[PDB]
Amino acid sequence: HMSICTSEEWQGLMQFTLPVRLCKEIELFHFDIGPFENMWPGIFVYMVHRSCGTSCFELEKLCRFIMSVKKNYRRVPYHNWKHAVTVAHCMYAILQNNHTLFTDLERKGLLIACLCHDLDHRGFSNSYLQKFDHPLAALYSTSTMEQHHFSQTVSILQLEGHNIFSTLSSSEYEQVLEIIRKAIIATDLALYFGNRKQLEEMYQTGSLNLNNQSHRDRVIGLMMTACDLCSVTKLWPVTKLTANDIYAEFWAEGDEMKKLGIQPIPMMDRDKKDEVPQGQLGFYNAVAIPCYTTLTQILPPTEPLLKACRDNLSQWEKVIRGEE
Ligand SMILES: Cc1ccc2c(c1)nc(CCc1nc(C)c3ncccn13)n2-c1ccccc1
Ligand SMILES: [Mg+2]
Ligand SMILES: [Zn+2]
Numbered sequence: 001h002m003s004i005c006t007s008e009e010w011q012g013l014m015q016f017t018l019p020v021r022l023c024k025e026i027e028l029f030h031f032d033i034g035p036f037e038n039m040w041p042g043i044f045v046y047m048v049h050r051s052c053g054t055s056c057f058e059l060e061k062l063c064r065f066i067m068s069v070k071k072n073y074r075r076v077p078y079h080n081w082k083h084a085v086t087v088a089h090c091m092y093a094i095l096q097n098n099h100t101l102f103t104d105l106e107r108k109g110l111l112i113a114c115l116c117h118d119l120d121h122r123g124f125s126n127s128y129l130q131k132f133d134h135p136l137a138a139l140y141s142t143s144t145m146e147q148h149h150f151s152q153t154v155s156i157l158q159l160e161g162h163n164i165f166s167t168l169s170s171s172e173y174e175q176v177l178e179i180i181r182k183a184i185i186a187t188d189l190a191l192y193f194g195n196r197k198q199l200e201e202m203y204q205t206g207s208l209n210l211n212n213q214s215h216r217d218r219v220i221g222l223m224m225t226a227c228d229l230c231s232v233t234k235l236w237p238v239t240k241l242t243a244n245d246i247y248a249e250f251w252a253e254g255d256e257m258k259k260l261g262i263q264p265i266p267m268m269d270r271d272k273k274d275e276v277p278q279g280q281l282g283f284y285n286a287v288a289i290p291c292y293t294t295l296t297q298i299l300p301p302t303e304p305l306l307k308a309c310r311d312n313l314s315q316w317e318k319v320i321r322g323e324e
Contacts, residue, residue: 001155002156004064005064010063010067011060011063013063016041016045018046026046027093027096028093029090029093029302029304030233030235031093040081041067041070044089047088047089047111048062048108048111050092051092051095051107052111058167061161061164065157069115069119069156072152072156073119074120076123076249077123078245079121082245084115084116084118088115090114091113094302095107097301098302105175106220108176109183110179110223112153113153113224118187122145123253124145124253125253126188129144136148143188146185154177165177179220183220185221186220186221186225187228189228189287195221195225196225196290196291198218199218200290200294202215223299229287230305232284235308250268251269251270255270284312284316
């Protein structure tokens with residue numbers, strides 16, 4: 001049921017050298033992979049190399065894996081190859097800027113987990129899948145897509161020469177799977193509002209504890225949320241576009257619901273192009289600012305993320321108030 005990569009593709013991944021100019025820009029939180037499609041896979045490699053050592057992974061295995069993952073994203077406007085790497089890139093810049101909070105076991109687990117986080121996304125919501133009445137939602141009742149995404153990740157590693165976590169002991173092995181499992185589960189937005197509520201809480205009562213695992217787990221989940229939406233932390237011209245991608249998905253989900261006589265919720269209704277700016281402002285305030293605000297608080301070096309969200313937010317304000 002899986003999809004691998006022609007020997008051509010992966011071997012040329014090893015040949016790839018990131019051009020000297022993009023080296024300082026890549027370290028920036030607000031860096032935009034967008035202009036560099038040819039490089040996306042090779043950019044993920046370089047970050048692996050720079051994060052966790054030149055060879056935690058045997059090149060060929062990694063490259064095979066990376067390219068096989070590519071081959072398992074669909075060609076939809078938003079939850080596709082570009083987004084997985086964009087998410088990857090933000091985890092990278094997070095991990096780098098928090099150099100000693102995390103373990104090699106986490107940092108490679110997390111970079112992999114973002115790459116895989118939306119594997120084989122079809123371009124439908126959990127809602128749409130459960131609300132009527134898909135085999136994937138027939139299988140996994142809550143967090144429909146995110147479990148599929150992890151099982152997809154799972155089947156990629158279980159392949160011939162793809163198990164880049166092989167050399168690890170079986171204890172360390174099924175442990176990163178546990179990092180990656182929960183990592184991917186966390187990007188179910190539904191679950192995030194609770195997680196943030198709880199973390200909000202812990203930080204106040206001087207109670208949040210990076211030693212405790214299900215505290216670690218929560219801290220990370222928040223990092224996964226924050227990565228996932230980092231669209232909203234890129235320079236405005238990049239944030240305008242990455243939004244256009246997002247609505248072409250939603251509105252394509254709205255259409256499949258109109259085709260049935262059913263009003264889609266307005267975020268997915270193309271008959272509301274002008275309601276969007278307002279809706280975006282709402283999203284920044286109800287979901288985004290909290291996410292980055294609470295991330296900044298727990299991880300101060302990740303402040304530039306909040307700085308940039310804020311910048312976009314007021315850009316979106318300006319669009320509503322009629323100027324820009
Ligand atoms: C008329 C309308 C109405 C609401 C809308 C909307 C358009 N649009 C959005 C949010 C759209 C959006 N932008 C990025 C970057 C996203 N990421 C993940 C999920 C949604 N995202 N809401 C919204 C606002 C507030 C909360 C949740 C969703
Ligand atoms: Mg997802
Ligand atoms: Zn995502």
